[PDB]
Design a protein around this ligand. Structure first.
Ligand SMILES: CN[C@H](C)Cc1ccc(O)cc1
Ligand SMILES: CN[C@H](C)Cc1ccc(O)cc1
Lengths: 602, 602
């Protein structure tokens, strides 16, 4: 369709499209009301005219207005103003896509339940297509997916898959050992996911019994091996281990580098070491877009290592924690769904308006990481993160649709609840996601353009912060960026030129955070808002040491402070990719930071 | 406030309040838009006037309209017309509360994330109050709760609690054995939940280490005992066992009676037997409002048995699966939150309009079951079932707020995600639930009146079906109700007077189901819609045998057919409590069933 205008797909930083939203919103409500009325048009309304003007009705409507006025007062006092175009530089939140908002309220009037096709065929059919759209977003050939309440639960479902997968070889030896005849025991704990899947689908009349002897029964949960995750992982991963049965003790942190990506050398050291101890690797977790720094694990290097390890008989499951960055992969896909060759990226992105100044914006490392996702077994992807779809809407994609038989209980599921971890599920959530995917195709013609704006906006912010120097009363405060962003997240810290006190810097940034958040003051009057996170040795190691030293801090300070406090901005506003529009908000960020620093002294 | 009018709280069976909904809906949107604009009123709109009338904008808005028109076409073709006043007699679906609908779309414009207070203080504060409102709904003295994506996941969180609770005594023996000095091993596996909780909160500096040696680590998951559930349980319970680590093999079905409630005799036989084998009881699941029959387990009898078993040193955790019936408990609570004495119920219910003909509507058995919930450790309750709150919104209540320390990771949580099973969570869901609880108090002055209408509507349907006899061309088809409803669910079957063929009846009811569902025809033209379920010996035993014989079927037929097919109606319409309004739809149900039977022959 040539090239769509992202500015028509948001209510707006200043409600510029408020009328458009209301008109479409009310049109949709009207179509629903009309649908209600003409189901059984012969039925007369149960609520009479006299009822609707009676006093009982009025006092109830007034009580309802009272409640909504209190809800409105509370929302309008404390909610976060991240709809702003260039003043909110923090958490993974901006506006959400108007078509999703519209479709959600529309779908909610029907209130269909997607756990069961009978309850809502249309939103049920819609969720199946969303699953296939997740798969093609991941270049899965014959893959699948479904909407999940959120990323954490999708991650848990990742472990549910992996845990059950590693247990299936042992369970084949117990029910139909012919499938795994002549296989060692350690060979069974290192079968590639596909061999396990080909074997299970081979034993049609025995699938039920093999699954009955699987990790579903409760047996062999420590036998199935260690779960490896980046040391900077999201706590949902701990929670996932805990809940799924392998437990916290079967979770091994793989160290990260100075770019805060899984050190593939130490990943190799850990996997090979465990293999010498005959300890199986349940799976490895690669994060494409880490929570605290927006880093992209080299997924290619992770899957190539699995390829170089299978010669030594070592196979690990790979699940990609793309809760945040999953939708980003649409920037690499052309309208035929082919991964754009890297050398053609800057051209295609210019052709499609994905990026508006033609330079390199995406590493080939980050590029390569995203392509390799198609080889992982499963992916967590949050529509309510970089899908710009409203909470609550997470996702999971599986490389092979058959894999869902490892988890099923008893093509379009008649009871999708039998193929997923959770239960009841809003068909409105599926309509909300389907609407976004069908207004914005999951490639450069749609989401690519929105992801590109995110990244470009993050890049202008990186170049603004670099060199940002403020003069705060004899003191000169200087801004330093953490690493060049692998995605759209820009971490940064403020430091006094001279102060070699790292706990004093951490207290400086903890003070700018306080003045740039709900802590100090009214959020509705905050001229600049950000988030903050702590890099502590227990979880980050000395991964920040190169950075702490770049700033002039000693290895002793680093150990004395034991952590570094950094401000993060997951730059999700779509309005800042235009240099000129960013230039409007640059002086308003420096000015807001100037009094926030001046306030931290005096 | 005297007595509120349920008819103002729904868009309506025929959109009678459509205008009211749109006006409030648009008022709310306008307040949000105004809030956006006056965050930083000095900022000029980023989207220019020229942009909003440009051609790029128009084609994108048109593409968006195209997508919504396809969403609308699909929704209006296949969605279920359960908004109708008295024609939908099936699944747990009617209208949802307008204030919830309104609050949800309002909250969604802010799109706050409740996993973290910073992301949305107002909806975060709202969810805390919802938790306390869940607790007081359960008469928990100093209890707690939170919204859960759905019932299944709340059930899973129930097992997460129980699994971790039974493991804590063993873990105290490993980290601070003083707490459990002189305690046998089997005594440790039978400590009452409160003793475990008092001991954990006693060891302040060791809480972290005890939890590190708990079931969170992965150890002792088969040591902690068997999970007992009604044989007619929801598959989420199987799924819960599977996922949580104890596995399918640690799940013991307790037989049910002819009223399809947990046979407390056989519950006692199972628990005492396991105790003679020194096998601990992880917990028992009591269902208040079963999925397929709306039966209410005698929770009082379950907790009194626990009281009579602790003398023999046998303690079991009790979790109440009230996904469906949980909100029903509001019918028993007066405006000071005291459980209404049973002998005063029919008076108070008449006083408050909870019931409109003054007779017994609620057994003292069902009454007693509901009161006993206050002694259970935790409860699953679905706002999106009998809360009339839109999907997706489940719930969990815990008897003792401290219990959440058994599950926490690292008063108003600053990171509610550290106190719950799931992760990201729509603040809009909390606003939606808070709005309902604050328009309708969780007692006879609010939800009681809505639950009462449900039950009364179900009672008129029971008396209609009883005696419903149709003449279908020389054949005379007769309707038989399954059991008197413990709540608002009415099961029933159609039988040929004469046919002693039970598989032939099951095929008759499977044919009425086909004509009364999306199977045969357009759902939008179906004059009567219902659900259907199969009572199969593997899961129901001979619990339906008394019923199968009441209808004239042999114990041989029952074993020959191996199941009975029953139609279920979870009567959730609020419009049918008025005998006169039910009388309008009685002839339209018989007439719709008359041609649906006539169509099944010929
Ligand atoms: C069969 N009843 C299940 C347990 C929950 C559910 C499913 C579909 C619905 O439309 C409504 C409720
Ligand atoms: C810290 N980021 C977590 C992992 C997810 C999240 C939390 C709050 C938000 O407002 C948005 C996203």
């Amino acid at each position: 369709k040539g090239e769509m205008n992202l500015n028509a797909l948001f209510i707006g930083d200043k409600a510029e499209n408020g009328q458009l939203y209301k008109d479409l919103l009310i049109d949709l409500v009207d179509e629903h009301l009309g649908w209600r009325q003409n189901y059984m048009p012969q039925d007369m309304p149960v609520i009479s005219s006299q009822e609707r003007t009676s006093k009982s009705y009025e006092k109830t409507v007034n009580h309802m207005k009272d409640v909504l006025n209190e809800i409105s007062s509370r929302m309008r006092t404390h909610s976060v103003p991240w709809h702003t175009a260039g003043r909110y530089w923090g958490h993974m939140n901006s506006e959400t896509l108007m078509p999703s908002l519209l479709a959600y309220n529309f779908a909610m009037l029907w209130n269909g339940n997607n756990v069961a096709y009978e309850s809502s065929p249309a939103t049920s059919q819609m969720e199946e297509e969303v699953g296939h759209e997740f798969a093609h977003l991941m270049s899965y050939k014959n893959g699948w997916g479904h909407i999940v309440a959120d990323g954490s639960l999708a991650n848990l479902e990742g472990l549910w898959y992996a845990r059950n997968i590693k247990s299936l070889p042992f369970a084949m030896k117990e029910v139909k050992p012919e499938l795994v005849a002549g296989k060692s025991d350690w060979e069974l704990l290192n079968m590639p996911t596909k061999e396990i899947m080909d074997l299970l689908e081979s034993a049609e009349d025995e699938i039920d019994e093999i699954k009955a002897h699987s990790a579903r029964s409760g047996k062999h949960l420590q036998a199935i091996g260690k779960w490896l995750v980046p040391q900077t992982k999201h706590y949902s991963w701990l929670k996932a281990a805990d809940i799924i049965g392998i437990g916290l003790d079967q979770v091994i942190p793989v160290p990260v580098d100075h770019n805060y990506r899984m050190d593939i050398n130490e990943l190799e050291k850990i996997v090979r070491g465990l293999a010498e101890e005959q300890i199986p690797v349940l799976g490895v977790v690669g994060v494409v877009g880490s929570t605290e720094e927006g880093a992209v694990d080299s997924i290619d290097k992770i899957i190539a290592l699995r390829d170089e390890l299978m010669k030594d008989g070592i196979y690990y499951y790979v699940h990609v924690d793309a809760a945040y960055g999953g939708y980003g992969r649409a920037i690499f896909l052309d309208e035929d769904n082919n991964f754009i060759p890297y050398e053609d990226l800057q051209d295609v992105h210019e052709e499609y308006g994905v990026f508006k100044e033609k330079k390199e914006h995406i590493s080939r490392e980050v590029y390569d990481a995203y392509k390799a996702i198609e080889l992982a077994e499963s992916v967590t992807i949050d529509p309510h993160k970089m899908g710009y779809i409203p909470y609550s809407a997470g996702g999971i994609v599986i490389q092979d649709i058959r894999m869902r038989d490892v988890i099923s209980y008893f093509d379009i599921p008649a009871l999708l609840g039998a193929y997923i971890l959770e239960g009841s599920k809003a068909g409105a959530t599926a309509a909300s996601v389907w609407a976004a995917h069908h207004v914005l195709p999951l490639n450069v013609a749609g989401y690519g353009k929105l992801i590109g704006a995110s990244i470009e906006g993050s890049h202008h912010f990186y170049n603004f912060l670099n060199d940002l120097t403020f003069k705060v009363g004899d003191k000169e405060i200087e801004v330093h960026t953490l690493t060049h962003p692998d995605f759209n997240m820009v971490d940064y810290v403020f430091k006094e030129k001279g102060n070699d006190d790292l706990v004093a810097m951490n207290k400086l940034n903890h003070d700018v955070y306080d003045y740039a958040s709900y802590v100090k003051g009214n959020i509705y009057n905050n001229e600049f808002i950000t988030s903050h996170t702590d890099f502590a040795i227990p979880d980050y190691g000395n991964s920040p040491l190169k950075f702490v030293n770049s700033l002039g801090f000693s290895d002793e300070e680093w150990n004395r402070a034991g952590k570094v406090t950094v401000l993060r901005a997951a730059v999700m506003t779509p309005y800042m990719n235009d240099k000129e529009e960013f230039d409007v908000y640059a002086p308003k960020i420096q000015a807001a930071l100037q009094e926030k620093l001046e306030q931290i002294y005096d």
